[PDB]
């Protein structure tokens, strides 16, 4: 890197030998032939209803006047009765008592920090307060409000659209990856932090916004950490941009310092007392204990809804059916009030999200009707369900973990932090004195649980982050002003990986491939695989595989019904090719037979998750549009062609050649090309005899090291496709890999001369 790296046939240029790079160059030239247009202009309504209001000199009183008026200032329409009822209710939120104090701070500072307990009205009200003082629409801009969580962004936008008496997708909208609900009319845009990051990649100054509100900063996601850095600089280049940092942690010092001694507004807490119940003994099996305590609460405690925290969608759906079924049994057998039960988790469709806010069912019984929401930690600080009085806290969540010594992420179910435990308990005290049932000991809470979780950036593989920073035009990656810097070595490794992928050249600059990959909301390996696929004559099939990989395991395997579940899977299963299996299932899911059969019944009878398949369907559609937009041809070859499956395996390889494992000759296990790790094929797939080399999607770390979602690949293909990576010079000494790598190359040379 110091002097220009030299390349040669023995140590080749990864960019020059990248098949996907070749595709990107073809696509780039096509685009350069018909340069795509610019963003459609924003549009707004102005009939003088804002006359008399002066930007940045607004008051709560003036705003209230408009809100109290008969006609909606942002539109031309009469305010509805629904609106007025919602209006008087939300005016009770703690944030309203400080509206004027907030405006003052907003008016006199470019950056401010805003802290308050969840439920106090931060996400719903504040951005509305800003619309009145900022009148962004009259100056041709919007205001962004960023959420770490998709569900918070979607549901809160739906609510705020109601609070503003406008249509969702119009004046108030949301933007999520693969799911956009905005238009030329949108003024207030709730969105994931990931999506604003992506907007910034296209427009470094985020010129479309006059105010950016980074919310739930206390979660310290990668995306908000990056946005905080970026915005700390953008703010020097645009005096017209205002920035609000919102957080639930009444801790602000560190944030204020980071943002050049920015001022702080704190909302006093209004939470009612919450009585804490602990288990006397350690609880080995929390699910059934959680279920038991929900039913006990419902049968014995007075009115008040229940919030149960679980860990993931499968577990949650399982608990929904068990609690639902036992609830019904309690009505008929003991005369309990009705008990409604709702799931909440990351992938829920919007309609279903909205169900959690439904009133508890009325009892015609004399015993209280009651709602149970069974939620992931979305319900920890990201949103509130009015009427919760009881929380059940098993003490676990799904957390990203990184391993520097093995260089790999993995999502594990792990004990929560004490701060998280505190937040969960707090949800019980929003409306009245509540109770929180912790499925662990008081000792464990006081001495075992870690105080605070580490920021995501310190628990992350940074290959996506590096490509993003590069796209943002950041050259000095080491000195990017992170609030908590990652270890330099994780960054270096990411740069190297991106170079091998040919997204960056050896001097750290974007290639045509890197530039194009940055246009897809996908991990670099996936985007590269997709980009190159038309060069392998199978972009239609790679399209579906990438969509299928962007979604949870689709196959349902009940513990008590394994045999039939497996029978069903084998209908689609491809030997030595889990990746092909995904293609089969999706193709069948889209079949006329399936549709004729009744799609939902079809998935159920086939042990398939309709929710995941439908999400894959939408993702495929959105990806196709990107491919049309950037001129990546949609390719396929005849299924009857001896090269069909070959092409697919090769395209997979072009992206995943660094996630390859070779069959251990002596130990009858597997060894990974990168880092030389001993691993076993995950139990969920059966290896065939001719599968000496496999490409794997995932590294799973239970008690042993497993490799999951594998497809066989010919070694000569790896060498042919990624010569720079499969150069024995950088290969450590012997075990089986280098050794049999040499053998492969020998065999390959030996074949040339004869002819
Ligand atoms: N669909 C909904 N989404 C969010 N909040 C709602 C919804 N329906 C009613 N509310 C009410 O409005 C408030 C939403 O507060 P929220 O602005 O999300 O605050 P914060 O962001 O500070 O946790 C809750 O206190 C609740 O009383
Ligand atoms: Mg909020």
Three-class secondary structure assignment of 204-248: CCCCCEEEEEECCHHHCCHHHHHHHHHHHHHHHHCCCCEEEEEEC
Which residue's structure tokens are 């307060």?
129
Cα–Cα distance between 628 and 534 in angstroms, integer? 12
Residue 486 CB less than 6 A away from ligand 1: no
Measured from the CB, is residue 121 less than 6 Å from ligand 1?
Answer: yes
Residues at the annotated binding site?
Answer: 116-123
Between CA 500 and CA 18 the distance in angstroms is: 9
> Candidates 90, 119, 188: which one to mutate for ligand 1, based on the most atoms within 8 Å of Cβ?
119
- Nearest ligand 1 atom to the CA of 122 is 22
CA proximity to 52, closest of 25, 38, 24, 73:
73
Q: Give, for ligand 1, the residue of 147, 164, 383 to mutate: max count of ligand atoms closer than 8 Å to Cβ.
A: 383
Compute the distance from residue 439 Cα to the ligand 2 centre, in Å. 27
Q: Is the Cβ–Cβ distance between 398 and 376 less than 8 Å?
A: yes
CA of 385 to the centre of ligand 1 (A): 7
Residue for token pair 């099996």: 285
Does the beta carbon of 386 lie inside 6 Å of ligand 1? yes
Look at the block and give the residue holding tokens 């008590």. 560
CA of 122 to the centre of ligand 2 (A): 6
Return the sign of the alpha-carbon dihedral for residues 473, 477, 481, 487: positive
CATH of region 39-270, choose from 1.10.287.90, 3.30.1370.140, 3.40.50.300, 3.60.9.10? 3.40.50.300
115 CA to centre of ligand 1 in angstroms = 15
Query: Edge-to-edge strands of the sheet including 264-266?
Result: 179-181, 172-176, 188-192, 142-147, 209-214, 242-247, 111-115, 264-266
Boundaries of every domain in the chain = 1-38+501-755, 39-270, 271-453, 454-500
Q: Could you give the CA distance from residue 658 to residue 649 in angstroms, rounded to a whole number?
A: 14
Cα(123) to ligand 2 centroid in Å equals 4
Residue 250, classified by CB atoms within 10 Å of its CB into exposed (0-12), middle (13-18) or buried (19+), is: middle
For ligand 2, the distance from its centroid to the CA atom of residue 71, given in whole angstroms, is 28
Residue closest via CA to ligand 1's atom 2 equals: 159
Q: Which residue has the tokens 């017209």?
A: 240
Neighbours of 452 (CB within 10 A): 14
Kindly tell me the burial class for residue 508, based on how many C-beta atoms sit within 10 Å of its own C-beta (0-12, 13-18, 19 or more): middle
Atom 26, ligand 1: residue with shortest CA distance = 386
Report which protein residue has its CA nearest ligand 1's atom 7: 159
Query: Is residue 138 within 8 Å of 54, Cβ to Cβ?
Result: no
DSSP element (H, E) containing 147 = strand 142-147
Phi, psi of 638 (to 5 degrees): -55, 130
Q: Is the CB of 247 under 6 A from ligand 1?
A: no
Residue 717 · residue 694 · CB < 8 Å: no
Ligand 1 touching residue 29 (CB < 6 A): no
Is the CB of 383 inside a 6 Å radius of any atom of ligand 1? yes
Give a three-class secondary structure readout of 260-306: CCCCEEECCCCCCCEEEEECCCCCCCHHHHHHHHHHHHHHHCCCCEE
Q: Quick one: tokens of 137? A: 């629409």
Report the 10 Å Cβ neighbour count for 685.
21
Q: How far apart are the first and last CA of the chain?
A: 41
Using the mean position of ligand 1's atoms as its centre, give its distance from the Cα of residue 121 in Å: 6
Residue nearest (by alpha carbon) to ligand 1 atom 9: 386
Find the 394 Cα to ligand 1 centroid distance in Å.
Answer: 25
123 within ligand 1 shell (Cβ under 6 A):
yes
124 close to ligand 1 (CB < 6 Angstrom): yes
Q: At a CB cut-off of 8 Å and minimum separation 6, what does 145 contact?
A: 123, 127, 188, 189, 190, 191, 213, 215
For ligand 2, a single-atom ion, the residues with CB < 5 A are 122-123
Ligand 1 atom with least separation from CA of 354: 1
Ligand 1 pocket residue status of 122, Cβ below 6 Å? yes
Helix H or strand E encompassing 152: helix 150-163
| Ligand nearest to the backbone CA of 121 | 1
Burial state string for 175-200 with b = 16 or more CB within 10 A and e = fewer than 16? bbbbbebbeebbbbbbbbbbbbbbbb
| Torsion angles phi and psi, residue 717, rounded to 5 | -70, -45
Neighbours of 530 (CB within 10 A): 28
Q: Rounded CA gap, 169 and 157, in Å?
A: 9
Residues in the chain: 755
DSSP notation for 309-337: E-SSHHHHHHHHHHHHHHHHHHHHHH-PP
DSSP state of 341: E
Report the candidate in 310, 438, 293, 440 with the shortest Cα–Cα distance to residue 373.
Answer: 310
| Burial of 106 from C-beta contacts in 10 A (0-12 / 13-18 / 19+) | buried
Task: State the closest ligand 1 atom to the C-alpha of 125, by its place in the atom list counted from 1.
Answer: 17
Q: 């229940």: which residue's tokens?
A: 306
The minimum-distance atom of ligand 1 relative to the CA of 90 is 12
Count the neighbouring beta carbons within 10 Å of the beta carbon of residue 202. Answer: 12
Spatial separation of the C-alpha atoms in residues 693 and 715, rounded to whole Å = 6
Ligand nearest to the CA of 215: 2
**C-beta separation of 529 from 697 below 8 A:** no
Q: 10 Å Cβ neighbour count for 509?
A: 10
Given CATH 1.10.10.10, say whether it is the number of domain 454-500: no
Residues 6 or more apart whose CB falls under 8 angstroms from that of 717 comprise 649, 650, 653
Ligand 1 contacts CB of residue 119 (under 6 A): yes
Q: Does domain 271-453 have CATH number 3.40.50.300?
A: yes
Residue 587 alpha carbon to ligand 1 centre in Å: 41
Transcribe 468-498 into DSSP letters. HHHHTT---STT---SSPPPHHHHHHHHHHH
Q: What is the largest CA-CA distance in the chain?
A: 91
Task: Please give the number of the atom of ligand 1 that sits closest to the Cα of 124.
Answer: 17
384 lines ligand 1 (CB under 6 A): yes
Q: Are 50 and 73 in contact (CB under 8 A)?
A: yes
> Roughly what angle, to the nearest 10 degrees, separates helices 539-549 and 578-589?
90
Contact 314, 380 (CB under 8 A): no
Q: Whose CA is nearest to atom 27 of ligand 1?
A: 386
**Considering Cα of 300, then 305, then 309, then 313, what sign does the dihedral take?**
positive
What is the chain's Cα-based Rg? Answer: 28
Please report the sign of the dihedral spanned by the C-alpha atoms of residue 646, residue 650, residue 652, residue 658. Answer: positive
Q: Which atom of ligand 1 is nearest to the CA of 382?
A: 23
DSSP state of 444: I
Q: Could you tell me if the CB of 118 is within 6 A of ligand 1?
A: yes
Choose among 589, 619, 582, 609: nearest CA to 698: 582
Nearest atom, ligand 1, residue 120 CA: 22
Q: How far is the CA of 384 from the centre of ligand 2 (A)?
A: 8
Q: How far apart are CA 302 and CA 191, in angstroms?
A: 38
- List CB contacts of 492: < 8 A, sequence separation 6 or more: none
Taking the centre of ligand 2 as the mean of its atom positions, its distance from the CA of residue 55, in whole angstroms, is 26
CB atoms inside a 10 Å sphere around CB 302: 7
Centre a 10 Å sphere on the Cβ of residue 471 and count the other Cβ atoms it contains. 21
Ligand 2 center to residue 246 CA distance, Å? Answer: 9
Q: Rounded to an integer, what distance in angstroms lies between the CA atom of residue 216 and that of residue 419?
A: 14
Q: Which ligand is nearest to the CA of 128?
A: 1
Contact 297, 306 (CB under 8 A): yes
Torsion angle of C-alpha atoms 680, 682, 686, 687, degrees rounded to 10 = -40
Percent helix, percent strand, percent coil in the chain, to nearest 5: 45, 15, 40
Rounded-to-integer distance, Cα 683 and Cα 680, Å? 8
Residue 413: closest CA among 289, 523, 314: 314
Closest alpha carbon to 615 in 591, 586, 595: 586
Spatial contact of 504 and 497, defined as CB atoms under 8 Å apart: no
Give the separation between CA 659 and CA 672, rounded to whole angstroms.
7
Is the CB–ligand 1 distance for residue 159 below 6 Å?
A: yes
Which numbered ligand comes closest to the C-alpha of 156?
1
CA 248 to ligand 1: nearest atom:
22
Instruction: Count the alpha carbons within 13 Å of 91 in the hemisphere toward its beta carbon.
Output: 12
Q: Do domains 39-270 and 454-500 have the same CATH topology?
A: no
Between the CA of 103 and the centroid of ligand 2 the distance, in Å, is 19
Nearest bound ligand to CA 271?
A: 1
Q: Quick one: which of 694, 656, 676 has its CA closest to 732?
A: 676
Question: CB within 8 A of 169, min separation 6: which ones?
Answer: 181, 182, 183, 186
**370-375: strand order across its sheet:** 274-278, 434-438, 388-393, 305-309, 370-375, 339-344
Pairing of strands 408-415, 396-403: antiparallel
User: Taking CA 422 as the corner, what is the angle to CA 414 and CA 361, rounded to the nearest 5 degrees?
Assistant: 95
- Give the Cα separation of 706 and 198 in Å (integer): 33
Q: Reduced to 3 states, what is the DSSP secondary structure of residue 439? A: coil
Closest CA to 328 of 614, 273, 320: 320
Ligand 1 atom nearest 383 alpha carbon = 18
- Closest residue (by CA) to atom 19 of ligand 1? 121
DSSP secondary-structure letter at 98?
A: G
Q: Is the CB of 382 under 6 A from ligand 1?
A: no
The ligand 1 atom nearest the CA atom of 116 = 22
* Residue matched to tokens 């169900």: 355
Residue closest via CA to ligand 1's atom 1 equals 159
- Ligand 1 centre distance from Cα of residue 2 (Å): 54
Binding-site residues for ATP sit at 116-123
Query: Which atom of ligand 1 is least distant from the CA of 118?
Result: 23
Query: Three-class SS of residue 97?
Result: helix
């Amino acid at each position: 890197m110091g002097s220009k790296r030299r390349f040669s046939s023995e140590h080749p240029d990864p960019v020059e030998t990248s098949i996907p790079e070749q595709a990107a160059e073809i696509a780039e030239e096509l685009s350069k032939q018909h340069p795509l247009p610019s963003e459609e202009p924003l549009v707004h309504h102005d009939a003088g209803e804002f006359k008399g209001l002066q930007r940045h000199h607004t008051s709560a009183e003036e705003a209230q006047k408009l809100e109290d008026g008969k006609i909606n200032p942002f539109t031309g329409r009469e305010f509805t009765p629904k609106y007025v009822d919602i209006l008087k209710i939300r005016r009770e939120l703690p944030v309203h008592a400080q509206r004027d104090e907030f405006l003052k701070l907003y008016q006199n500072n470019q950056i401010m920090v805003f802290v308050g307990e969840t439920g106090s009205g931060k996400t719903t009200q504040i951005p509305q307060f800003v619309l009145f003082d900022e009148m962004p629409h009259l100056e041709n801009t919007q205001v962004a409000c960023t959420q770490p969580r998709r569900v918070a962004a979607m549901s809160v936008a739906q609510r705020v659209a109601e609070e503003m008496d406008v249509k969702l997708g119009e004046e108030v909208g949301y933007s999520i990856r693969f799911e956009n609900k905005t238009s030329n009319k949108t003024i207030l845009k709730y969105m994931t932090d990931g999506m604003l990051l992506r907007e910034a990649m296209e427009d470094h100054d985020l010129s479309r916004y006059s105010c950016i509100i980074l919310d739930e900063a206390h979660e310290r996601t990668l995306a908000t950490d990056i946005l905080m850095g970026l915005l700390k600089q953008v703010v020097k280049r645009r005096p017209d941009l205002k920035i609000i940092i919102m957080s639930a942690t009444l801790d602000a010092e560190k944030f204020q310092r980071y943002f050049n001694d920015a001022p702080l507004l704190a909302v006093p807490g209004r939470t009612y007392p919450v009585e804490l119940y602990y288990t006397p003994e350690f609880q080995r099996d929390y699910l059934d204990s959680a279920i038991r305590t929900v039913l006990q609460i419902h049968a014995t405690e007075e009115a008040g809804d229940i919030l149960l925290f679980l860990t993931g969608e499968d577990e949650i759906e399982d608990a929904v059916r068990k609690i639902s079924l036992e609830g019904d049994q309690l009505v008929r057998e003991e005369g309990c009030g009705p008990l409604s039960v709702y799931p909440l988790y990351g992938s829920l469709p919007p309609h279903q999200q909205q169900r959690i806010f439904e009133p508890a069912p009325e009892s015609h019984n004399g015993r209280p009707g009651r709602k149970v929401v069974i939620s992931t930690n979305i319900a920890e600080t990201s949103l509130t369900i009015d009427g919760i009085v009881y929380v059940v806290d098993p003490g676990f969540s799904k957390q990203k973990v990184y391993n520097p010594r093995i260089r790999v992420e993995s999502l594990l179910v792990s004990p929560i932090s004490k701060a998280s435990a505190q937040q969960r308990a707090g949800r019980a005290g929003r409306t009245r004195p509540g109770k929180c049932f912790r499925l662990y000991t008081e000792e464990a809470f006081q001495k075992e649980l870690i105080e605070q979780s580490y920021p995501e950036i310190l628990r992350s593989n940074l290959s996506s982050t590096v490509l993003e920073l590069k796209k943002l035009g950041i050259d000095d990656l080491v000195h990017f002003d992170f609030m908590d810097p990652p270890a330099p070595e994780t960054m270096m490794r990411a740069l190297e990986e991106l170079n091998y992928l040919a997204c960056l050249d050896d001097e750290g600059n974007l290639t045509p491939l890197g530039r194009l990959a940055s246009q897809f909301p996908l991990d670099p390996m996936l985007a590269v695989m997709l980009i190159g696929s038309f060069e392998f004559q199978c972009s239609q099939e790679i399209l579906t595989i990438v969509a299928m990989l962007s979604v949870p395991n689709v196959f349902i395997r009940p513990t008590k019904d394994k045999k039939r579940a497996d029978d069903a899977k084998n209908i689609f299963a491809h030997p030595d090719g889990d990746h092909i299996t995904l293609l089969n299932v999706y193709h069948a899911f889209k079949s006329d037979e399936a549709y004729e059969y009744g799609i939902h019944k079809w998935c159920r009878d086939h042990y398939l998750n309709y929710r995941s398949l439908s999400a894959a369907d939408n993702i495929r559609s959105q990806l196709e549009r990107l491919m049309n937009r950037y001129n990546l041809e949609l390719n396929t070859t005849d299924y009857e062609s001896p090269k069909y499956f070959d092409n697919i395996r090769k395209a997979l390889a072009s992206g995943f050649f660094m996630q390859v494992a070779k069959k251990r000759s002596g130990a009858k296990g597997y060894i990974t090309v990168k880092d030389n790790q001993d691993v076993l094929i995950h139990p969920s797939t059966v290896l065939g005899h001719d599968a000496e080399w496999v490409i794997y999607n995932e590294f799973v770390l239970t008690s042993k090291n497993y490799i999951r979602t594998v497809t066989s690949v010919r070694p000569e293909w790896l060498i042919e496709i990624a010569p720079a990576y499969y150069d024995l010079s950088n290969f450590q000494k012997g075990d089986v890999k280098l050794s049999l790598e040499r053998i492969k190359e020998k065999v390959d040379r030996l074949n040339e001369l004869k002819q």
